[PDB]
């Protein structure tokens, strides 16, 4: 859907921000679960290798060359290509109880 396309575009932009750009090679579908917050998607897909040109914008313009996305206009993302439970419940969350002790 449009939300899944926007989510994968955001994930690819995050990839391009810091580790050359690689596009999708082994495409796959998604299932999503729209109920917490405006939207939520669960999409997996493989990426390309190396690149024909470097720094060719965030979007992939090079036609010739199992992830995990759980995002909520996104208030949190853990795309790594898991902790989707708390991210999907973000829309109070992300407390990570403690954080302040010798424990």
């Amino acid at each position: 859907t449009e939300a899944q396309r926007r989510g994968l575009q955001v994930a690819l932009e995050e990839f391009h921000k810091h580790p050359w750009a690689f596009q999708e090679t082994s495409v796959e579908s998604a299932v999503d679960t729209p109920f917490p917050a405006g939207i939520f998607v669960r999409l997996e897909f493989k990426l390309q290798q190396t690149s024909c040109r470097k720094r060719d914008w965030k979007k992939p313009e090079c036609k010739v060359r199992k992830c995990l996305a759980c995002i909520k206009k996104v208030l949190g993302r853990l795309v790594h290509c898991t902790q989707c439970l708390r991210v999907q419940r973000a829309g109070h969350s992300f407390y990570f109880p403690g954080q302040f002790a010798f424990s």
Binding site: F15, W20, L75, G76, H80, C81, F96, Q99, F102, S103
Partner: protein
């Protein structure tokens, strides 16, 4: 122009959702300066009498626990001084957590048993003359160490290192292991820690010290001038530092009016932890080197 390999793997948990910080580090530094040197001096000088009675054993155990706690404190000050960033591995964080719990519980239990032993000392002249053997002291210190070491499961099952946005972090994770364990392992463990490490010890210290000072055995040949002040000072020092730490530990309720409603993300809890370190540092100097029995050999 390659940043990775055929299998593209990474991790990024990015999510959009001063006055106290400096004071915490200052308190940590003063505690460390007043600590490890003084504790090492106490350890090296405690040779007052070879194979002395139970009091020297209590003092040695307390000093050792405080020394280990304060020499592992610099890891915590490094962690807190790097803007809540933990670059070390999960194993080191687990070891630090376990040894910190062990040392703090050991110190609290040793102080409690010191208070109980003193209460049995002054009040009871008959039943304390037949139950003060050195072997009994060894047995009880072994039991205290075993109880402080076999309490709580930080054994890599309740503590995981997870990097948050641009900052690595290791923390106690009472979840993500089983969906059934929902609000059943984070509250029970905290309540157990509060009731064993603060409730019974504080109650015992209060009852014993108050009944000892107020009634003074109804007998003479006791210097009530220094004794009352020393008891009050040690009680105040114990209470004023561990209490905020334990209320912050029990503060983990997560719903009062908003997500936090207490701005705990700042250095308030680290400041209370520094107060706990200050109390741990101040205990040996307030017990071993200030009383009238000592200070005559040096």
């Amino acid at each position: 122009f390659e940043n990775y390999s055929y299998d593209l793997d990474y991790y990024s948990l990015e999510s959009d959702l001063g006055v106290v910080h400096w004071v915490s580090l200052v308190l940590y530094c003063l505690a460390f300066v007043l600590g490890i040197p003084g504790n090492a001096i106490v350890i090296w000088f405690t040779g007052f009498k070879w194979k002395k009675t139970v009091t020297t054993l209590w003092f040695l155990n307390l000093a050792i626990a405080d020394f280990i706690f304060l020499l592992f404190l610099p890891l915590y000050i490094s962690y807190v001084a790097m803007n809540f960033h933990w670059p070390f591995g999960i194993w080191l964080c687990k070891a630090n957590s376990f040894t910190a719990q062990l040392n703090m519980f050991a110190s609290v239990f040793f102080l409690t048993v010191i208070s109980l032993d003193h209460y049995i000392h002054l009040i009871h002249p008959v039943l304390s003359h037949r139950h003060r053997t050195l072997k009994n002291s060894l047995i009880v210190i072994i039991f205290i160490w075993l109880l402080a070491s076999l309490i709580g499961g930080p054994a890599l099952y309740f503590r995981d290192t997870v990097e948050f946005n641009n900052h690595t972090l290791c923390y106690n994770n009472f979840q993500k292991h089983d969906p059934d364990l929902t609000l059943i392992r984070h509250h029970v463990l905290t309540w157990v820690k509060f009731i064993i490490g603060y409730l019974f010890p504080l109650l015992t210290m209060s009852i014993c010290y108050l009944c000892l000072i107020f009634k003074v055995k109804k007998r003479s040949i006791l210097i009530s001038s220094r004794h009352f002040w020393t008891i009050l000072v040690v009680v105040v020092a114990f209470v004023v530092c561990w209490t905020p730490y334990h209320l912050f530990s029990i503060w983990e309720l997560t719903i009062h009016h908003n997500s936090y409603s207490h701005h705990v993300m700042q250095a308030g809890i680290p400041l209370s932890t520094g107060l706990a370190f200050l109390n741990s540092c101040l205990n040996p100097i307030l017990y071993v080197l200030i009383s009238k029995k000592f200070q005559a050999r040096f």
